Amino acid sequence: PRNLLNAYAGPNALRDYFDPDCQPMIPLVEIPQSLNPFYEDGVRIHAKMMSMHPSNNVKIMPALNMLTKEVQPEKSKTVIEYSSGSTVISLALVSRINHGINDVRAFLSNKTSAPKLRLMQFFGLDVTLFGGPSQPAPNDERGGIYRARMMAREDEAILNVDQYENDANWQSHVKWTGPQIHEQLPSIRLICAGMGTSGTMTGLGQYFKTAKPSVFRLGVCTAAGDRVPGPRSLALLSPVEFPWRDSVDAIEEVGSKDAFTLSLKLCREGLICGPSSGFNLQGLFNYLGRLKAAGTLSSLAGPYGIIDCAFICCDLPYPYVDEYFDKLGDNAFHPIRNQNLAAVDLYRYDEAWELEPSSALSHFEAVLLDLRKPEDFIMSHIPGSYNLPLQSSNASTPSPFTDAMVLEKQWKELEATFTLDRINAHDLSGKDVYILCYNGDTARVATSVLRAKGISASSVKGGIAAVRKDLPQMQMAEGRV
Amino acid sequence: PRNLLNAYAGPNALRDYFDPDCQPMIPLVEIPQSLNPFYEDGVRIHAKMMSMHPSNNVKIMPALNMLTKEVQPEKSKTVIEYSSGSTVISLALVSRINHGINDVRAFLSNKTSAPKLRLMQFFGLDVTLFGGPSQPAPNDERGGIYRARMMAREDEAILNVDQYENDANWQSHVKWTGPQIHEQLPSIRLICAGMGTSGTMTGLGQYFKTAKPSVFRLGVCTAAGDRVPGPRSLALLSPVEFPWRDSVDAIEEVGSKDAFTLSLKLCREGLICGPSSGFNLQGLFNYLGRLKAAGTLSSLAGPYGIIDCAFICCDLPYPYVDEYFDKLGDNAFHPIRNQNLAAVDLYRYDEAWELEPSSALSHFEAVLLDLRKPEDFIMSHIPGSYNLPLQSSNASTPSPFTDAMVLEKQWKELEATFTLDRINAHDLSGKDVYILCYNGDTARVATSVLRAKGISASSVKGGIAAVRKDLPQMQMAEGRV
Amino acid sequence: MIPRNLLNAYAGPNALRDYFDPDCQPMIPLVEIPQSLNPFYEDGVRIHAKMMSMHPSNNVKIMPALNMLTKEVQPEKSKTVIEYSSGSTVISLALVSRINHGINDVRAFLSNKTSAPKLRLMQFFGLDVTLFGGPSQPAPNDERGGIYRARMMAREDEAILNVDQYENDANWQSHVKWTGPQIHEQLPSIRLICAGMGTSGTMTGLGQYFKTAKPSVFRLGVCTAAGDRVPGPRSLALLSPVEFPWRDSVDAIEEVGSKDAFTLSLKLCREGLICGPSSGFNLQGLFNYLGRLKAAGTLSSLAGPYGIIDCAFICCDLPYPYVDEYFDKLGDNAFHPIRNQNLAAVDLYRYDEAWELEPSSALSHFTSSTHGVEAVLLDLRKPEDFIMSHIPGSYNLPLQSSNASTPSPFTDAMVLEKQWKELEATFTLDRINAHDLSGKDVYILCYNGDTARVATSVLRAKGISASSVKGGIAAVRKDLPQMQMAER
Amino acid sequence: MIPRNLLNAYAGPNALRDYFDPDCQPMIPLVEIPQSLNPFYEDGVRIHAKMMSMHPSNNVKIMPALNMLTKEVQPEKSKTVIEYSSGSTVISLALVSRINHGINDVRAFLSNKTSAPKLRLMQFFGLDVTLFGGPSQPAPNDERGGIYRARMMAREDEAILNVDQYENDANWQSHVKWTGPQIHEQLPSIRLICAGMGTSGTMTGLGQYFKTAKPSVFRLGVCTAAGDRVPGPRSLALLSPVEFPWRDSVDAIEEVGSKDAFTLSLKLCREGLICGPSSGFNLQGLFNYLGRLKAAGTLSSLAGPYGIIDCAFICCDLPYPYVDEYFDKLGDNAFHPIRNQNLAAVDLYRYDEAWELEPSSALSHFTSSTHGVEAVLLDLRKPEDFIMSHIPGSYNLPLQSSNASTPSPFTDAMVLEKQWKELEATFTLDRINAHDLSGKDVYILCYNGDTARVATSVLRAKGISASSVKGGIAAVRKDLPQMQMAER
């Protein structure tokens, strides 16, 4: 039945890996008390981490169930679907794993984020952008849902399962998701899921309608005028023909700021899930808050006085990371320390460029650069070396690697110092350039600058202080010719 | 022992969820034959999807093992670590789940990508950037590894486990990862893992050194001068003091282009993993290619003539999506169709703004805008309406929702049309503005333009062709006053 | 005693030669400056300006140019004239080379730092300019500056000629020949002669002449104050290497800054003595010397047995090439500001009375031609007035800046700016094509008519054949039954 | 018969009044243009230029300005002068208002489209400019243009005065009084008189005078060709509303474009008759009419019993305010290009001979002052030469553009550009602080010495007190033992 060792081999290893009946049950995890403001009221909330399927999103269940139902083995060569992201990724994976179909065309709104659009391309989707409403009605003849079902109707090699209109959508959660939650949480008193196509909620609600009729079925929609990835609003849901009205006992409306806030909290607790997951949990919070404000929370409780709630976590937060910062204030994140270093010191450092004093002077076709101030150079320097001073490097200035502002000034002055004319004015091109400063640190920054400009540059570890220590017998010129 | 139902409840649900002994074994999946160029030679390659731990990366094993070893319950209040990303995310999760520590400070190179830096902030890390080499030696006194261990040495409330120097790193894979692969693949003939801190490889190599001494242990390093997230090069690995030289039988060197290529292929097969995972598989490919070129591949084979290879998949590709496009050519991705629509039609469309002809004219404080050409307006128009023509909208021009170039021209001309002066010149401010065109489509684009500018605008579904059809009794002015 | 042209009429094939001749010409005018410009008038000094700017060439250097070329040019060998110059000398050489000697290949060696307006002036007069990058006013023997290299090129070629104003005695001798004797005859009671020093030819000539012709006249040279720069003269330091006997030609030397030079030059112009910065530079030196003797109480000595003291100073050229510098050197005061200055950036295009049509002629042309293919009528009124009554077949393009209350844009500059800007912002290329205005007669009707004429200026600048209905909508009220009926 | 100033010397408290008086002044010069400019010289026509630009005011409008103000000004009531103008008239009014009438509050009403150089010129002459946005050359009765509004303001206030050049007969009567009689006396054989028409005062005056004083002279007016624009005149269409009897003053009217006007004005200047665009505009009209009769073979009739035909045309003002337009209107030819033009953008800063020091004086100052606190020595040579031998205590700042082979930057313009650019790019603010040059005496040593002087120009423009070692490293070879020993 199920894979005990979670080990999949043979020609069908990937098929069985994605199989919800063969792979272990999708994890169900109770959220911590610190995140559950109804813990003292006896509420225990459990998160169904659909993001932990190998596909990383809840829409793998409709995609699996639809494709096995609708694919015709000899003739089905192309799959087309309108989607907000998750379904077409799941269709792309299942079409290859189960059906050998690599031509998957994704129809998406032109107002889907750039990271999400790049993720579609990443998974090998062929995407076409559509103007107008990002969430059109399946009968809006100007929208991508209509165009998709009409392109597969004129060509039998083209297949359009219809996640907005194909019953195999919600039946996938009667088949898999529902029974899993029931076995994992036999004391379940409330099931909660947000509604986009509504397939997830109606599937769960149709299953629990007869598997445990005492279970309360709570769907979540996006507040009017708001937008969150995954669900749609109550208005955008009315034209859909799935039996969602028979699968829910109450509807909550949730905004995007709460959704992204709770998703961020869940991820920091260890339950890594995306914005719609925090959206769902917030809807559950809002309904529990009504029953407490109405004094009716006792109605959900079982014989032990506890209320076991399960809610769906639909996918991962990674595709939406930038949106968390646009929607949530800076107060939700620690700022970067030494943030200025992101725009500077951009180039690599190789340990082989840093040479011990004896090793560097043995190679010395070759040119030695001294980056100390002009009067320090005249006082004493290695005979044969050129002087090239810097405003930002004294004998007293701190090491650039201990002061981010020093590193910024020194790196920038070094980038401006080593212009093209400068390289030729000192004959650095094509030679082994050895660099020396006071303690070696500014010189090492200079090697990163020069290596990125193609000059074979090395630095002396410890600077001139180490050559005076390690090589005390090498006598030094003290402006004398 | 292990959680049969994958259901975690009680105050320790999250602790047990992250527990590798309590949670099902990390999946091991054989890669498809199409991705395995040595399938006919009898090689079967199995991927250990460490990315499928709830933390989504392999470094959860060192983080778990180190923190339980080093945390002192009463005094340990702050955790500090230098990392390339994975470890500090895993330390942030485990420090909160197992030890109640929320003060986690991450020391990172200034040359880590911006998406990765934002991911650190996302998971609640307090990050400080460090110049110089992005992968310093643990004894480089200018690098972040030294600074981390020295800041926890001066303060007992500060804890620095040392992933580069703490043996609990690699022992975590002797404890968990090794035994899991052995039980999942008893016929294992070769174990493969890339080396950054080397903890993963030495742990696996120390375990199999005595669990099944016939197993070949293959480590992978980054080719000289190259860079891939996770591992380091053979040179950057020499100073580390873990017994990695006793845990490997051969070393492969792999470049970044191959690493990102194979990761992309793995993700498109259904094994969603990041660049170091394709890096590892490529190293395995390169060693198998030597033995075939040397005719020695038979040496790895078991009694049935097959060679069972296991390799580590370390994390997910999502934080690196943009890097795949910089490293791989455009030839690896389908381009966006109607790409021009990404920069235009930027605003939302609400179904309630589109009104049937009878419904819109019933509300008609109110102003009706007609967007048809001037001669068409004079020919016949709804009495009481203003005319506002557009260069890009004829009676013959196609619907904007069927031609992306038409949508771009019309939307841009509409954005330029409805300037501030225009809004006041037609008294649109504060009124209910109804918009009419030929077929309704240009008018609907105009409502998205005007709603985003704060004007309460609605369109007539079907345009003037529908008011002539649905309302044939409403007589129309035909430039007559 | 040569006679001068009493009719100032110059005919014949030598009309231009005689016109430029300081002996045929009337004498260069000498004009006493007014009291309001003479601080020492109450002390008996009379300051007379020698307006060298009034020669046909407009500058003092026509005298050295005439004299040097007459001396140096070889009728059959000379074919090219080359000279280093700051501007005046080489313009004068171009004129004399052609008028008097039939030479047009005149090359001008100039500093690379002379102003961009001045460089164009050299081109304007048909000069051939080569730039030299060293010091602006080099020493004549500096083997880098143009003075030396111009001299050597004239040595290598026997067909080209460098008269060299910097050490040819004919330079300063031309003022012994003309300027000196003229001033002496125009002002016999003269007691002091003043001139700035660039090459020092003008001052050397005046001082050498008056040294013997009237030894009692004081000779006052003017040099540029160190660190400063004035067009024409040189600083004392920059003047020492020239070998003209200028030290023997002056009895004292003043130093003057550029701010004072431009200020006094500007005041002389507003008095009617139109002259450039070096003229105010010379007058300021004279003021400074006269103020030195007045404060020391030695002012009386310069006089004679008469109480008056007659001083003459040189006015070298005209201010027009330097107008820009007066604004940079002097403050925002001493100039009246341009009022309605905002209009300088709007209403940039021409008007034509033919574009403004009587209402009956305009409505006749509109309904003559088929509507929407040959002619359109734009009605700029607010949409709720347009709806009430309008010319059938016309288009409504509302203007926010225009309504039934707005006054004439030509009576308020802010209205003109707002309305011209909105009209310019209204008639984008899409708007022209949205109403298909191209190739059509366009008629404009507004509340005003003045606004509508502004609209015709804007549209015809864009190539649209637009005309306005004179008098506005008020002038066609009698042709609009619906409008007449609404007023019941 | 009033006498004229035979000395051209004007003294006394009325020196400026007499200086501007056309009756005290010598007559405005009349000068025959040369054959090279007269295509019809072989046919017996002699064309004489009346250089009105030679009045002290430099323009033709001083005659209407003098005559109108003399007529209209009220000694005790008049305190402000207001006039719409294109430029010439209102400058002349400012001068006459002060010289002759002691009035300085002169307001100038100008089109908002007059050039930015011309607007500054109005400010320069102390005028008070108000801009008007309508048509540039409005009709005198257009109640929007400045002509009408200037007239009304003078009506509301009995203390201000608009002489109104556009319909005051004293405008054209001033040329019956002066310009006409002068030309007639300067050229008694005259057969034709030619002038452009703006207000038409000049042509009306000349034509009304010659109509009776010598009825046989042909009167040839010139107007601006439709669609074109010339500074001064008007088009025939724009001229019809003025009520001067100009139609009665002309026997024919030519139309001329602006390109021909500027081309001929430029040629007249290079001949020595310095005059502006309207002057070439008048001459081109005369050429066009004479070419019409020559092609028709009716040229002989204009003559007399003599074979010659003497024509006079007006030259109105000077070209200097319009120099920019000649470049825009005419091609790149007719001007010589500036050679070494690249130098105009480099070597922007001054030089001083005191900065260049004899080698012994430079090395003396350097080792006098303590090194690195009061003085530094920069050695611009290549690092491998600097290592071989250098002045002890000096810093090496290599230049790629300079080495022992490079010639003098003042002998090759490309070397000067490269070296000045690299020196400017070398001495960034960090470089000055990297060697702590601020507040120190700085001495420059190079292979050349010329390069080192360029370096001193660059550094002193940045405030660094830099001097150069004259003669370069070659001049200090005797002071360098190590260098002498290497040459064995």
Ligand SMILES: C=C(NCc1c(COP(=O)(O)O)cnc(C)c1O)C(=O)O
């Ligand atoms: C509609 C699809 N999204 C459903 C979805 C939902 C909503 O689940 P539904 O089955 O559509 O009701 C929630 N969260 C995420 C991340 C989702 O992708 C889609 O990818 O086309």
Ligand SMILES: C=C(NCc1c(COP(=O)(O)O)cnc(C)c1O)C(=O)O
């Ligand atoms: C060093 C850590 N990275 C190790 C790593 C590796 C290498 O595994 P090691 O245990 O360091 O040898 C591979 N792939 C990814 C994504 C990784 O993050 C870190 O996050 O600090």
Ligand SMILES: C=C(NCc1c(COP(=O)(O)O)cnc(C)c1O)C(=O)O
């Ligand atoms: C040197 C020349 N300038 C002399 C000059 C002077 C000086 O006059 P000198 O005769 O050169 O000393 C004053 N004012 C103006 C306008 C001048 O042009 C020249 O044109 O090259």
Ligand SMILES: C=C(NCc1c(COP(=O)(O)O)cnc(C)c1O)C(=O)O
């Ligand atoms: C109208 C005036 N211009 C007349 C003019 C003319 C025309 O001359 P009239 O006398 O205005 O017809 C020609 N050339 C120049 C340079 C002029 O300035 C004026 O100054 O306002």
